[PDB]
Amino acid sequence: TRVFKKASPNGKLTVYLGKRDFVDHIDLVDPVDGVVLVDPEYLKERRVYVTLTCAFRYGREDLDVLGLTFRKDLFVANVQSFPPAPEDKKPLTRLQERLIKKLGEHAYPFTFEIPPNLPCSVTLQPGPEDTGKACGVDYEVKAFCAENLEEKIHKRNSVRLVIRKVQYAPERPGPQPTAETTRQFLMSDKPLHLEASLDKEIYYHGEPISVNVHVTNNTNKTVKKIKISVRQYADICLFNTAQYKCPVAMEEADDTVAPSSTFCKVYTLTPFLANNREKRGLALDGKLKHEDTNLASSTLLREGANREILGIIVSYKVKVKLVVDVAVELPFTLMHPKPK
Amino acid sequence: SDIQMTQSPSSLSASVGDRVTITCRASQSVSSAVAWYQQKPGKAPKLLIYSASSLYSGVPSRFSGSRSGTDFTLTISSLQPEDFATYYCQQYKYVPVTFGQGTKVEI
């Protein structure tokens, strides 16, 4: 099954894990669990702790007030491992118990029940001038020998793992999104009617987005150009909400419509990261390291409430605009399929 | 860097119904990133196994993979008259993707 692991620099403490990308089912998050292998003969301190940290680190235009980069732990939980805590009488998982068999009595378990609504692992694309730690929401697992919480943990006997919380496309589709707008003009009460629709609700990354358009112009004005673009919003809400605003792909057609005429064609947008590198602040899916990752997949809020979700929330919608100007926006979902 | 996939045996034969095993060692730890190909004489290869254990769609169950450290194995549960071909071991954890030298199976 190929479990992971990490060994403390001194080699005294090591933490095992079954997987590092924990799926989110909208309402529950898979329980982070594993084991820690410790030896009492080198652990006179008599405590081996594990710490799950849901760090949120943010940049943006704070540099002008000096390097005021800040981070706030949106969620922290701890568990005592080497001295078995009496209250943690929770049955082991298959992975934990089979690892215990593999390892013997010198390993101890742990597990964190991450609650829902915690932001998904998301990274914001750094600008070329940024060189510090990449900003965004991330998760991290700590394990350290110690004697109490107040004492600062030594790098010598600490292990740092970075996991990520991941969300996958629903097993069933939504409704075919559609949107239309009717405009009236000072010349006369004669409408300019614009419609737009997409092929399907959920689009996997890299899959083309087919936009179905229809325009009916009964006015004397001429639609000089047709602007169609797909844009990404990232709702940043730590203390008070703020809105991001960033296109990711655009097609500009010089198509027009004569007075009292109709027009209809299908376009094909396809978001991709190749040409969007320069856009600082763009949302990318959470990385496990300084690797390359696709555009941040949409986030599925828990239930219909969607109230008080911290961190970064990403969502997409495609804008159809006519340069008479008239525009309409149409939402869609952009996330990977569930791997087999 | 380069990762020589020393595949062996460079040739073998087995009757229909006999179980056959092909071994492929990676000159460096490539994790579980290996895939096995079947190339009929003169035609484009075909993918069978990926991730060194996963069975592709369509391919018969007779093909099964396995891993042990840097040693990878492909085993045919029962060789059939249409299974005589050249099989190639491929790793893909590091670029450049490197292929084995192949093992022609003979009637």
């Binding site: 479990v3 593999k102 | 994790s31």
Partner: peptide, 7 residues
């Protein structure tokens, strides 16, 4: 650094 191991 991180590594891997087979149950």
């Amino acid at each position: 650094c991180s590594e891997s191991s087979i149950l």
